[PDB]
Amino acid sequence: METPLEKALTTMVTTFHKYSGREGSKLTLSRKELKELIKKELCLGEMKESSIDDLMKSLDKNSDQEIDFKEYSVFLTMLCMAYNDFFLEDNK
Amino acid sequence: METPLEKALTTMVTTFHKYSGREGSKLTLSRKELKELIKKELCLGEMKESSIDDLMKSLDKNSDQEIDFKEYSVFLTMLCMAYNDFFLEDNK
């Protein structure tokens, strides 16, 4: 369609299909493998540490149950908010 | 940052800051603003319809309250999952 957010969602669904499109579901996978997707396709857990280190372990906390694209996008978003101080003015 | 899935987050923060960063919060905006953001970020009036309005109507529902970055990313995730049968197998 050639809109800029279409290329964001295209990127997210193509990188999700890089780990789900092996197997019997293309919208879900295990908590274990989404965690792995994030640290491979997004360099962040080497620039940053605090909270990112639990969110990683918080999929792997139960690990081998399924997730949909929601638990993917809230974690990508929540993790972005942990260094989005590039968009603040001050401590608030 | 600079790995392929960043360019999705980079897009989402670049677009969202163009309708939050009108006013004194560069991380929140109204339910009216999220509605404006999405209908300029994507064309939607020609593909899958109608089930795309009760989501936007669910912004109208409380229209003058605020919205965060996460409501924004789960609404777009939800809406992408609501009409990309184009990613599936058929069948359920």
Side-chain angles (χ1 to χ4, degrees), chain A:
Chain A
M1 206 283 143
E2 315 316 295
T3 93
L5 181 72
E6 183 192 61
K7 311 331 205 180
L9 272 289
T10 300
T11 299
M12 294 175 157
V13 303
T14 302
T15 47
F16 195 86
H17 193 292
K18 197 254 195 79
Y19 295 89
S20 63
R22 298 147 95 200
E23 283 155 82
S25 172
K26 307 204 309 293
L27 296 184
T28 64
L29 78 184
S30 68
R31 342 279 296 177
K32 202 185 247 77
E33 204 78 319
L34 167 61
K35 186 212 77 254
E36 215 59 40
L37 151 54
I38 291 172
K39 257 299 309 191
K40 267 67 175 175
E41 316 308 300
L42 246 171
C43 254
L44 293 175
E46 66 305 281
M47 297 190 313
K48 209 78 143 85
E49 23 50 72
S50 299
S51 328
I52 100 83
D53 189 64
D54 179 79
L55 297 173
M56 283 274 101
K57 273 52 145 291
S58 278
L59 291 190
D60 239 302
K61 218 70 68 76
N62 297 97
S63 211
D64 296 305
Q65 359 173 265
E66 290 182 84
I67 31 169
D68 75 281
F69 215 100
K70 179 197 299 81
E71 298 221 55
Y72 172 38
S73 63
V74 297
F75 185 178
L76 287 185
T77 298
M78 174 163 55
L79 182 53
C80 209
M81 295 176 81
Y83 54 81
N84 275 354
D85 43 296
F86 302 116
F87 311 128
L88 282 269
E89 305 83 53
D90 170 41
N91 209 109
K92 54 72 263 132

Side-chain angles (χ1 to χ4, degrees), chain B residues 34-49:
Chain B
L34 179 63
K35 162 176 285 192
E36 176 67 357
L37 167 62
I38 294 179
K39 282 280 183 169
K40 273 71 180 179
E41 282 190 295
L42 270 161
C43 211
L44 261 173
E46 70 303 272
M47 301 179 296
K48 262 72 73 86
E49 221 300 288

